[PDB]
Design a binder for this molecule. Structure first.
Ligand code: 1AZ
Ligand code: 1AZ
Ligand code: 1AZ
Ligand code: CL
Ligand code: CL
Ligand code: CL
Ligand code: CL
Lengths: 463, 463, 463, 235
């Protein structure tokens, strides 16, 4: 897609405003808006100036350059709006700003090429979420609470009437034996379809193997993979469309890893493959599970760097409520073909060389896909460069198998101790990694740590 | 105190019932009751039989032998009752049961003697608590809360009326400059006095240096130290009297380390000294801070074993909300004379040899004083036997000074890796230590871990 | 009064506890409690040890020595208690701690003697207060409020029923022409009498010229003056008795300078005189208003140092809502005999030399009487030493007359610029003065400053 | 003049769009405690015969002699100038002594903490200008813009030299006063520059000073602040 394509879309759709989007460090998209009449060639050539304490998120002037591939009509905004993502550059030097996650993903792609190992890295993501009717919470000196709720939640079978005073009509209970029952057990059919429809209208490609699935209030819609940077752009747009389709229909969505205690967490399975000159590099009939030397070494990198890698793929305290030491949890540092409990799974794709890939199962949707995908590639590339050999694969379901760390503070420690692979080619900088480590320690790890947990009162009030 | 003393007390006080008390593992006193008419010589000689799944706390017959020193009139029970603590013995062998905390404290005292190092270990404890008007909490699939409250709590200055509908009369706010203001700022004077009065009537000795102190809803009443076992008996009785004085006056007390976020935690400062043949062993004019070689080596043991020792002195998840990495927190593994931030403090006592002692400042009231005091003595004794030299003392207020671990799971790991000093003389058994490690992992650490924290919703709901 | 007097009081009154009281910097009395049985001669000789971060108010061990003159039976505490004030000493050196206000007052008295100017400074204070039924307030991100209330408050004439649902019986309105109407306009007669009675029972001397006065919810009971230190002790005890008599009778008292907008503030008029060898020093038939050279020069000191002196006599932000630039406000830096608007007034006492004195009218009850009285004496003494001549007196009711500053921040600046007179003889130390300046700036001036005032919303919301 | 008209119309449109949609807008400097205040950054330049006057390649930050002297005027008169650019008691809850607050009487190119900032515009002479960062929307844009121009013009006429610029982020740098009453005092003491050419009159300035003292400063002053009850009720 070219600048002219974008101008043509703007004119055809009679766009009134252009929304200038850029990603912040933790992974939320930021924006400001300009009139469409000021969206011209000088935007692509010179860029847009914007106050650089505003672009940076802390308390100098920054320049924003558009990525034409990310242009999309906003389906929610009443005034007709075109959304485009931008890269952050220094105004004087035109240098890509080293802390813009989009630049990092771009640097990752360019680095791949410069190593001669491959020219394209494809990422496919399957991200789950929850649909709720309400959420509330607070944290005070003498007490603390949260509550999420849904009319159809299984904890509500006893309600005399619904929240609006209408009668309880049942069909709430989750049964043993089937996670995806039809209506009326499925109480989100029309809403999910709206989400699906919005995705398709927004350029997501759904073909063979792509589907819309729902289980209680949980849902997932998967879609065609893309090259690294644009795959992350797709993820951001996916979350945007899901959250706002829900919002416009009187609901509220979360992508947090673990909103419900004693119910499924929300994960993001990440499919990965490397390609060169239009040809796949992951396949070999002779290797275990059809994996080439390049593939096996990539896996080697993932498994070796996993303890630090989770700082980006599972970057929140709440992530570790899903990655829990005693379940089906994708926490085992092995690769497998059958074991739905290993970090790396090799989906069974037969002898078609093009389809061969590796699925990293540990990640969740709680962070920054630009950083997560980049970090995953860097682990894989360090694995190839140093020919790292992974442990023997495990196809059967003790103390022998190593685990991912169980706390964010631990994975942050591991990142601090081992981030050399991320700095190769200057993709991540030491400056950025230190900032990420600080941020998580001061704003996330410690604030949770110092606050008594409600269950501590159950355990200890009467000691 | 002898059996005859106890029978005389029973007859003089016209006791109607005798309460048979024994300590469970985590540190809560257990009981059953017998008519006074069945409390005779055969109780001291033969003991009392009781179902041994009931005495053990998990799902064989056990024998209970009374300790005459622990006999006290219950000041709360309407029917006149005598409370006495017991040791748990095997019925066939008369062997002290290895998992009864009271036996462990006795074993610790006997072990001390058998080493020839000293014949008596004195423990003095200063234990803080909070007085509240109410507490509630729960933990459900879709939400969780706790709330503690007090009419006079500083978070309640804005209340239109009190919980009973009476008017807000102020005097709630905590001021800078003074922690112990007089009434009406002090809103618990009469209740604290009732607690003091009950302690004195229950045989606690309050003399020079012993006081009743209050700060907002927090309070402390210290009292004369005692030999190890009986000091721990005194602590159990202290908690019992504080909790029930509150209960009878329409209040509720907690000894949990950290019930309030952004307010003082509750600690238990533990004074310790060793004595032989009626003479002190801790003093030496020539040593730093008046400390003998025996004292310094004891300190050496405390600081060397601290990371594992906290498994008993700070045995709960909530403990680590008080022992927090960035405050006045007694977490620094050094000894000092001025620094109110070191694990071990040497109170300034001048040249009086009798008063010389060491104060372990890290502990809290959340566990088992029998086990905590025993574990502290064993650390000190291992320090003496192996002549362990502590780091140079620090009298001034960076990365140089080692810290106590910051999580229960870490200190449980350290206990698992280093409990040799506890098994000396068979005081603690490997069996017991493994059980303690299991219990904390399965019943405390993991159940907190798997439950999303309310503040995780603030941080992450919208990721 | 001697130690033996105190022990005799303790024994005669069958005292159960002794309350150890010491004053913090801003002016609130602190306390802890000991059993009476531990109150013996060694308390007067050696003192009481107490944790010295607790005695100091910020986050080492301190020694407390009792003042036998301050011993009083507490009339409010259910358990029979003797209250005594203490001085704070360093445990090693026995040096009076330089930041204990009681020491400062003692140092001031000793300094006086050492100059040979006089041997006794007498202070008489008349302190007003308000009796309310309720007070509530808070300060949040999006809003703020306070509300004081009283059944009989003049703003309540329109209430359909009282707060308890009983009928409005009127007699609330303040009339022109008389401030002190009899019952039922006076709705606090019995309560005030209870306060009076409690003061007389607590050793306050009420004789010729001493009275109980009430106006709406405002009241004052004055009493016989005393020497500087013990006069301030009396003030602390006065406040204690007034606040707690109210509290016990379901009310709540404030001594804040200005709780009601558009109603009288609460002041503390301070009478002062110097005496030598049992003879007065302030009188001279030949001087204006019967004032000697020593008196006139003392006045000279008060008026010259007033801008800095108010940092202690009027130490709060709220003080300056009473000391307001356009009223009857005692803000004019002159002395007078008739003008009830001058800082210093000379009460008309005829030709009786003993009665001759000066009344400093500016102060309020919001701070620390130990520091305020001391500071006043130091101003007077600097006046005498340097023979400072005051402006000509003013007996008639423009830009000619200098004013006291109108903000706390201004008077703190003036204290910073001119505190030399306070350090004479080491009475106040530079260290203490700098601490006082910091405390008021960081904890009082700035926190008020950064918070939007409710009236700013009336003025400015719609700009 | 028309810039000020535009500001009035801006506020009118913002307030009434909100109003018609069931909301309510405030332009007050500081409605929320512990959240961002609301400011009004004012860009300024002088032009003659269709050509810009602020640019010079050779000067610091591309500033001509005329520009530098204009800045000189702004910084010298700032303590009195705030009586119009920051005319309310609530203004001084934004201009607070310990933050990112544009209260430092210096000019700069990088420091988002100086009264006067020079936006980076490269070598295009037309774009060169100065941004006065202190003002807020609480007063009168007609008076505020006028007062700013008069300060600048006095700076040019008297060739006032500003302190050396500061491009790095102690007691060395002068501050704007921290209370309305202080800035009103400063206006009373130094308003000569406003009366040049009869633009403002002494009559008007005295009226402004009276109004703020009697209707704003004093009425806030005499009223106990809710936080004073938190601090002092129990003294
Ligand atoms: C099916 N799939 C998924 N999806 C699995 C189902 O959920 C959506 C992602 N992700 C994939 C793949 C996937 O097949 N491949 C391999 C691949 C790469 C490039 C080309 Cl041109 C082709 Cl034809 C195939 C990949 O490289 N990735 C990343
Ligand atoms: C004052 N104190 C406290 N208290 C400090 C204040 O709070 C209560 C405990 N605990 C002490 C001591 C304490 O003094 N000693 C030393 C000790 C031991 C035995 C004897 Cl016979 C004597 Cl006379 C003195 C000790 O050995 N311990 C354990
Ligand atoms: C009447 N009065 C009051 N009261 C005025 C009414 O309110 C209570 C204080 N304060 C006084 C006086 C007061 O008279 N004097 C002078 C004074 C000093 C010492 C002696 Cl022995 C004598 Cl007899 C008289 C004083 O020195 N002070 C400080
Ligand atoms: Cl963590
Ligand atoms: Cl833990
Ligand atoms: Cl002030
Ligand atoms: Cl002001």
């Amino acid at each position: 897609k070219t600048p002219d394509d974008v101008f043509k879309l703007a004119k055809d759709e009679k766009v009134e405003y252009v929304d200038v989007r850029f990603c912040d460090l933790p992974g939320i998209m930021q924006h400001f808006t300009i009139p469409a009449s000021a969206f011209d060639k000088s935007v692509f050539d010179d860029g847009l100036a914007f106050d650089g304490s505003s672009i940076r998120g802390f308390q100098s002037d920054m320049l924003l350059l558009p990525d034409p591939e990310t242009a999309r009509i906003d389906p929610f905004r009443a005034a007709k709006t075109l959304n485009i993502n931008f890269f952050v550059h220094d105004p004087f030097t035109l240098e890509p700003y080293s802390r813009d996650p989009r630049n990092i993903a771009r640097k990752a792609e360019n680095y791949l090429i410069s190593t001669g190992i491959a020219d394209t890295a494809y990422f496919g993501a399957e991200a789950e979420f929850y649909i709720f009717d309400s959420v509330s919470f607070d944290s005070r000196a003498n007490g603390s609470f949260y509550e999420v709720d849904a009319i159809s939640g299984w904890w509500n079978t006893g309600a005399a009437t619904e929240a609006d005073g209408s009668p309880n009509r049942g069909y709430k209970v989750r049964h043993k034996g089937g996670y995806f029952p039809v209506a009326p057990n499925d109480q989100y059919v029309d809403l999910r379809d709206k989400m699906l429809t919005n995705l398709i209208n927004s350029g997501f490609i759904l073909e063979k193997g792509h589907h819309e699935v729902g289980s209680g209030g949980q849902a997932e819609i998967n879609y065609q993979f893309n090259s690294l940077l644009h795959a992350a752009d797709d993820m951001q747009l996916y979350k945007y469309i899901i959250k706002n389709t829900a919002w416009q229909n009187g609901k509220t969505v979360t992508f947090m890893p673990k909103p419900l205690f004693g119910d499924n967490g929300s994960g993001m399975h990440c499919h990965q493959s490397l390609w060169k000159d239009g040809a796949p590099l992951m396949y070999d009939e002779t290797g275990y599970a059809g994996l080439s030397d390049t593939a096996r070494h990539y896996i080697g990198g993932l498994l070796h760097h996993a303890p630090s890698l989770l700082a980006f793929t599972n970057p929140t305290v709440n992530s570790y409520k899903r990655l829990v030491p005693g379940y089906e949890a994708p926490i085992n540092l092995v690769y497998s073909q059958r074991n739905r409990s290993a970090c790396v799974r090799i989906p069974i794709t037969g002898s078609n060389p093009k389809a061969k890939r590796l699925e990293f199962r540990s990640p969740d949707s709680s962070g920054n896909p630009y950083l997560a995908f980049s970090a995953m590639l860097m682990a894989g590339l360090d694995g190839i460069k140093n020919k790292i050999e992974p442990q023997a694969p495990v196809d059967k379901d003790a103390a022998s198998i190593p685990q991912t760390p169980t706390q964010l503070s631990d994975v942050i420690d591991r990142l601090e101790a081992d981030h050399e692979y991320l700095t190769e080619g200057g993709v991540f900088t030491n400056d950025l990694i230190e900032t990420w480590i600080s941020f998580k320690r001061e704003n996330e790890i410690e604030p949770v740590n110092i606050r008594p947990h409600p269950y501590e009162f159950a355990l200890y009030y009467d000691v």
